[PDB]
């Protein structure tokens, strides 16, 4: 059982600067023929996992050349050149040289870039929930960066988290953004008792905060 | 071009059995040795099943000999995976790959794959609910939109727009656990001249409950 130990755990880069990936092996990946059998893969978010490199070195066909593995024995490196916004994902080295064939436990490639506000969007619940009993309140922040954001609910001033989730998309394979959204789920009977629901986010890349808000008596 | 898409897929019990299955294409399926590699919710991989391409010789790793069974049907370009005595470390999103041919020991081509949920939990059907802007100044370039999935186990939803037509600026966020069931949600955010210009829809699938749905989003 070939323990495959990878260091960063997380890497974040800027566009066009290189990121360098290591991967260390238990035991030696030279086969009894000298071959080495040990391949990477890069797995972007919502997909499969795909061959980027195959025998330490070799690029499988339609991966650009920036892309290029070294190393032997325990020791193997890949690096990314010219970092573009759609590498972002988790590269995984693999070996299959002994018997059980393992895998690393994943490198998360992360873009760097400039700070970046959110647009909120707040969501007042849908007469269809209200319908059936429920009042879910939604607000939405989109496109900023970096990851790290707290959003808090006041309902007529005052402060709520229960019923409370929050829940981030994936980094933007275009822009390099993320979004996210607070959803603050009540009964229609006490979304009913009060008028007035504010959104507030924070961050630590602002000493402001981000207001948004609404009236149901102004529905 | 080559795929393979599997199916199977579930919601099960301790102690049960269930059997996934990948309908390959666009190769000749008979002389390639085929896999399925599995990904557990902490995000990490393992080799759980290795079938020889005219399916004699079998490999199974020591974590699930004994329970799984690999089987190829050469005839109707079909792999199968056979699963028992189901473990909650069972519980993964398993993948049907293939190995390469010049035995440079390589999977070269992976399906999107089937989730396997191992638990006590029911299966549950989500609510769609729409995102509407109101009660408050929506004005101006453009206008956000989305849907809300809520009350599903197990998981994955996917939501798309306009039966895939509508990708751009579309974002999903992870679904979120809670009492035993997931939520997410899924927004557009469009040009204010073309909503309610035209009718605008999202598409929730959630495979496990065999479910599909279609909302509209209409103002007010």
């Known amino acids: 059982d070939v323990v495959m130990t990878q260091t960063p755990l997380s890497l974040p880069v800027s566009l066009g600067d290189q990121a360098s990936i290591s991967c260390r092996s238990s035991?030696?990946?030279?086969?009894?023929?000298?071959?080495?059998?040990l391949h990477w893969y890069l797995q972007k978010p919502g997909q499969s996992p795909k061959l980027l490199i195959y025998?330490?070195?070799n690029r499988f066909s339609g991966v650009p050349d920036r892309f290029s593995g070294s190393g032997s024995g325990t020791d193997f490196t890949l690096k990314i050149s010219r970092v573009e916004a759609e590498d972002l994902g988790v590269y995984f080295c693999?070996?299959?040289?002994?018997?059980?064939?393992?895998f690393g436990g994943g490198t998360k490639l992360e873009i760097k870039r400039a700070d970046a506000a959110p647009t909120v969007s707040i969501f007042p619940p849908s007469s269809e929930q209200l319908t059936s009993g429920g009042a879910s309140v939604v607000c939405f922040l989109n496109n900023f960066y970096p990851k790290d954001i707290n959003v808090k609910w006041k309902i007529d001033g005052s402060e709520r988290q229960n019923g409370v989730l929050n829940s981030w998309t994936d980094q933007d394979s275009k822009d390099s953004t993320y979004s996210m959204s607070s959803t603050l789920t009540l009964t229609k009977d006490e979304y009913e008792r009060h008028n007035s629901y504010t959104c507030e986010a924070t961050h630590k890349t602002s000493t402001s905060p981000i207001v948004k808000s609404f009236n149901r008596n102004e529905c | 071009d080559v795929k393979l898409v599997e199916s199977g897929g579930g919601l099960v019990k301790l102690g049960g059995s269930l059997k996934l299955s990948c309908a390959a294409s666009?190769?000749?399926?008979?002389?390639?040795?085929m896999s399925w590699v599995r990904q557990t919710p902490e995000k990490r991989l393992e080799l759980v099943a290795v079938?020889?391409?005219?399916?004699?010789?079998?490999y199974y790793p020591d974590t699930v000999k004994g329970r799984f069974t690999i089987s190829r049907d050469n005839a109707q370009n079909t792999l199968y995976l056979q699963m028992s005595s189901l473990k909650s470390e069972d519980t993964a999103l398993y993948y049907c790959?293939?190995?390469?041919?010049?035995?440079?020991?390589?999977?070269?081509?992976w399906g999107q794959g089937t989730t396997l949920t191992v638990s006590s939990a029911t299966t549950t059907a989500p609510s769609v609910y729409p995102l509407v802007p109101g009660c408050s100044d929506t004005s101006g370039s453009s206008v956000t939109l989305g849907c809300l999935v809520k009350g599903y186990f197990p998981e994955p939803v996917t939501v798309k727009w306009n039966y895939g037509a509508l990708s751009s600026g579309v974002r999903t966020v992870s679904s979120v656990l809670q009492s035993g069931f997931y939520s997410l949600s899924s927004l557009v955010t469009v040009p204010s001249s073309t909503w309610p210009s035209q009718t605008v829809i999202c598409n929730v699938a959630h495979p496990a409950s065999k479910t599909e749905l279609i909302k509209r989003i209409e103002p007010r």
């Open positions: 666009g190769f000749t399926f008979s002389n390639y040795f």
């Open positions: 693999s070996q299959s040289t002994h018997v059980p064939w393992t």
């Open positions: 035991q030696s990946l030279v086969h009894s023929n000298g071959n080495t059998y």
């Open positions: 079938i020889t391409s005219n399916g004699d010789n079998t």
């Open positions: 025998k330490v070195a």
């Open positions: 790959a293939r190995r390469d041919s010049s035995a440079s020991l390589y999977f070269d081509y």
